[PDB]
Structures are given as C-alpha cells and as structure tokens.
A and B are shown apart, each in its own frame.
With several copies, the nearest count.
Chain A
Amino acid sequence: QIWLKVCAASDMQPGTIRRVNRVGAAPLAVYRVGDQFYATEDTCTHGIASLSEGTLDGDVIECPFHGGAFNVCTGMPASSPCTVPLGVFEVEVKEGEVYVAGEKKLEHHHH
C-alpha cells in the first residue's frame, strides 16, 4: 500500500525503465539512472503513450509518441510538445530491494 515492492535493485541494468502496474491506479514508471532510482507516472502527460516504452537518455525520458521529454528526477517537461509536469513518486532501496511510493509527491510541506 504505502510502499510498493518493485524488484531487486540488481534486476535493473542502469539506464533502463521498468513499468509498475497497479490495481485500481494508473501505471508507474521506475527508472534506473546509474545507481539511483526514480519513479513517475508511466503515462505521458501529453497523451496516452507509455513512457516506459520510450527512450531514456541520462535522467531525461523521451516519449515514443511525439518526441516530448521529461526530467525523471523532477518530472518537469524537457522537450515540447509536453507542458504538464509528471507526477513523481518517491523510491527507496532497502535490503537491495526497490520500493516505490503509492502516492505521488505532493506540493505539500516542502521547500
């Protein structure tokens, strides 16, 4: 519920993406950038494409439908036509296991 087990950290090679299906909720995308892990909604905010089916270059994921792109850490648009920021989900590694938050980061109680 609060944290969703994704897979073993070792299961993902750096620079790859993994889609996380959720019953009752929209799918998420977990990205492994080097040794770090980030997560955002899987659905591009510009349409209905699956970001996990796109190209990950650095910490920027490129959508496969129209070439838009986002920064996987901040969820902000990096290339047009994307304009709406992606919801970001916290990720934590414990016991070498990857966990992704069940609720997106809230514009609540922050910097």
Chain B
Amino acid sequence: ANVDEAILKRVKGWAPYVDAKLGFRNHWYPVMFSKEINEGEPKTLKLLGENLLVNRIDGKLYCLKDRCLHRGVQLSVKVECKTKSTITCWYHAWTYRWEDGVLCDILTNPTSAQIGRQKLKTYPVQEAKGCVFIYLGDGDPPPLARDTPPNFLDDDMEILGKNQIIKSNWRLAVENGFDPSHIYIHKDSILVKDNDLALPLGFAPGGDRKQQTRVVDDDVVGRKGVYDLIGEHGVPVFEGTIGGEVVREGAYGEKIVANDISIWLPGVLKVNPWPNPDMMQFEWYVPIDENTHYYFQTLGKPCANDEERKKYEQEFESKWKPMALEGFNNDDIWAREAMVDFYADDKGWVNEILFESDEAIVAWRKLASEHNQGIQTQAHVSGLE
C-alpha cells in the first residue's frame, strides 16, 4: 500500500499501476554496462529502493543486499573482501558468501551460534548484450527474454548504450516515451533536419479504440506489452493551426522512421526504426526509488564482423549518441521532470484530463496492472512486517 486508499478506489481501471510507485517486483532490470564492473571490484547501486552490491568473481557477476544483518550498516562503507568468495562487514566482521549470502564466518567471534544459521539476501544477475540485468525478485527467475523487448537479444544485434540517473518517478518516464503526441516537444530537433527525417506534430486518430493499439498477451516468449498503432488509421498532423490560421508545421524528409513503437513490462520502450531506417532504440526506465530512475538507453543495429562494429562504434561516439540519445532525448528528460509536481501527491492520477492519443498510455496502464509480477513496497525495502 504505497498510495492513499481513497485514490486507489477511484482508479478502478489501473489501481495496481498507480500503487506501483516503487516499481514492479519480480522482473529483470538493466542497471549498468558490463564494462563498468571489473573482476574483484564491487560496485554499489540502488534498485526498487533496495541498496545492493554487485561483484565479479571469475568473470561471473553476483548480487548481495548491501545491508549487514547485524546492525544494518552498508558493507560498502568500507569494502573488505578477504577471500575471493566472500565479503566481511567492516564493523564486527560478519562474513558472507557471494554465491548464497550465507553467514559463514565471524572474525570477532568464531564460536558464535549465528554462523551458518543466517542468510543475507541475494539476487540473480545475468549479462547480455554488454548489459547487466538483475532479477529484483524472489524465487526462481524467468528467462531474461520475458523482460526484454523483441529483437534486443539478436545474435547480430549490436547493442550499444548510455546510462544516467533522472529525477522523476519511473512511470512518468514510461508515459512520456510512449505518448504518441509528445513528439511536439521535438519539433525543433536539429537531428530531424541533420538526418532529414520526417516527423509530424501529432496525429488525428482514426478507427475505434481497439485499433489504436495492439495488446500483447499471447507471445510465447512470455513478453507483455502494447504496440502503438495510432499511425495506421490516423492522419499525421504536419500543419498546426490556431483559429484556422497556421502557426506551426512539422518537419519534412524522405526518411520514414519510428513507424513502430511498443512498450513492454517492466518498463522498456521500443522505437523501430530509429534514429535511422537501419538502427533501433531500446530504453529502460528503471526505478531507483520513488523519485528517481535510471534512464537506460541503447541503440541496436545488426552486424556481422569487426568492420561492421568499429565503424558503428565510431558512428555512435561521433554522431548517434550525441545526436539521438543526448541531443534529441534531452528534451524528453525535462518534459519528464515537468510532470513531477502534478503527480507527486498522487492527485494527478485522478485529475489528469486525457485526450484521444492517450489511448495508448491507457492500454499500457491496464496491461501493467494486469500482468505485473508484483508490487514493490516499503515492506520489501526496510522491515518486511
């Protein structure tokens, strides 16, 4: 229960989603890139409100909760790995094994009855496409594919990316990237011209509700998402008018991009093709706590050899990353933050006045509320009563 009951009782269509301000438990989440964590160099990170520790032992990644069982201090305050397979708390030397979190020794009293009887929480970790995924959940984890958008795990798909921390709840990030009409904020994008792309100001829906989106619940890989089909039966708006007078126009170009966009649990958007007819963008909105998230953005592009990478790698650092990920998506970041106040007291979930193009967002909320694997609460974070 992370939200006032009176509010959850009003949004009968997607209460679980409104309540999930701390994110969905029992899902995988990219937290960093493999190149960021070397052998024997523990890194700290907060995910779904839980402080965690990640270490690489014999090339393999391990995840232990960053909070001693004794007096609850963060082990990372002073890292003490005395053996390849363990970590010793700097306070009273309680020692845990990275592979199962078991308390195997206590240097301050090797005769303690606690030894071998206590266990520190651990979480599954899997590397893929140069990305580190942590299963923030309990029990046996599902295939990493279930929480990845289609085409991310392709053998030839060269996945390159960037990562940073953004000051907004994760949901606001999701509903901004999957908002068909938010493209208006990009209307002055230099990338659009510097890649002569075609981008309308918005869209005039066509057809009925159902046709506006494609809800996925039959994928065998387990995925759960929604495709935004506003562009099929809808006429793009390239000329903005106020009182019959035209005051703004979209951008013209031969390059037809983003003619396919989908949002998938636990919170990753797929815009294909983008930022080029050959490339693709995959971006996660990872919940760190109730007010921040990791903006994990990547760019996929098929290849088949060294030369099909070094040139790309050169492109990424040269134009793409700076133009598409930063220069273009930076407009999304401050738009994301502009919605914080309205939803901060949870009142926005009841007072928002939606219009046609929000049909997609609504589908997403219903999907997420129905197929999320669990709601993260303060009980999971501090003291599970």
Do any CB atoms of chain A lie under 8 A from CB atoms of chain B in the complex?
yes
Interface string of B18-40 (1 = CB under 8 A from A): 00000000000000000000000
Q: How far is the CA of A26 from the CA of B113 in the complex (A)?
A: 9
Chain A residues whose CB sits within 8 angstroms of the CB of B117 once the complex forms? 45, 84
Find the B residue at minimum CB distance from A44: B354
Asked if B11 contacts A80 (CB within 8 A), the reply is: no
Surface stretch bound by B, among A1-9, A62-70, A99-107 = A62-70
Cβ of B358 under 8 Å from chain A: yes
Chain B residues whose CB sits within 8 angstroms of the CB of A67 once the complex forms? 9-12, 350
Known: A67-B350, A80-B384. A48 touches B356 (CB 8 A): yes
Find the B residue at minimum CB distance from A84: B117
Interface residues of chain B, those whose CB is within 8 Å of chain A, are 9-13, 113, 117-118, 209, 349-356, 358-359, 362, 383-385
Q: How far is the CA of A92 from the CA of B10 in the complex (A)?
A: 33
Give the most central of A45, A65, A80: most B CB within 10 Å: A65
The residue from A43, A46, A48, A64 contacting B358, defined by CB atoms under 8 A apart: A48
Q: Tell me the residues in window 52-100 of chain A with beta carbons closer than 8 Å to chain B beta carbons.
A: 64-67, 80-81, 84
Asked if A47 contacts B353 (CB within 8 A), the reply is: yes
Asked if A66 contacts B349 (CB within 8 A), the reply is: yes
Asked if A66 contacts B351 (CB within 8 A), the reply is: yes
B371 to chain A, nearest CB (A): 19
Find the B residue at minimum CB distance from A65: B13
A89 to chain B, nearest CB (A): 16
A interface SS class = loop
Known: A65-B11, A84-B118. A46 touches B385 (CB 8 A): no
Give the most central of B10, B11, B358: most A CB within 10 Å: B10
New A-B pairs, 14, CB < 8 Å, besides A65-B12, A66-B350, A67-B12: A47-B352, A47-B354, A48-B354, A65-B11, A65-B13, A65-B362, A66-B11, A66-B352, A67-B10, A67-B11, A80-B384, A80-B385, A81-B350, A81-B353
Find the A residue at minimum CB distance from B357: A48
Chain B residues whose CB sits within 8 angstroms of the CB of A49 once the complex forms? 13
Asked if B10 contacts A46 (CB within 8 A), the reply is: no
Chain A residues whose CB sits within 8 angstroms of the CB of B359 once the complex forms? 48
The residue from B11, B353, B356 contacting A46, defined by CB atoms under 8 A apart: B353
Q: How far is the CA of A84 from the CA of B113 in the complex (A)?
A: 12
Find the A residue at minimum CB distance from B208: A21
Chain B residues whose CB sits within 8 angstroms of the CB of A47 once the complex forms? 352-355, 358
Q: How far is the CA of A84 from the CA of B115 in the complex (A)?
A: 13
Asked if A81 contacts B355 (CB within 8 A), the reply is: no
Q: How far is the CA of A45 from the CA of B118 in the complex (A)?
A: 9
Q: How far is the CA of A67 from the CA of B349 in the complex (A)?
A: 11
Q: How far is the CA of A50 from the CA of B12 in the complex (A)?
A: 13
Q: How far is the CA of A38 from the CA of B380 in the complex (A)?
A: 34
Q: Tell me the residues in window 22-57 of chain A with beta carbons closer than 8 Å to chain B beta carbons.
A: 26, 43, 45-50
24 residue pairs from A and B, CB less than 8 Å apart? A26-B113, A43-B113, A45-B117, A47-B355, A48-B354, A48-B355, A48-B356, A48-B358, A48-B359, A49-B13, A64-B13, A65-B12, A65-B13, A66-B11, A66-B349, A67-B11, A67-B350, A80-B384, A80-B385, A81-B350, A81-B351, A81-B383, A84-B117, A84-B118
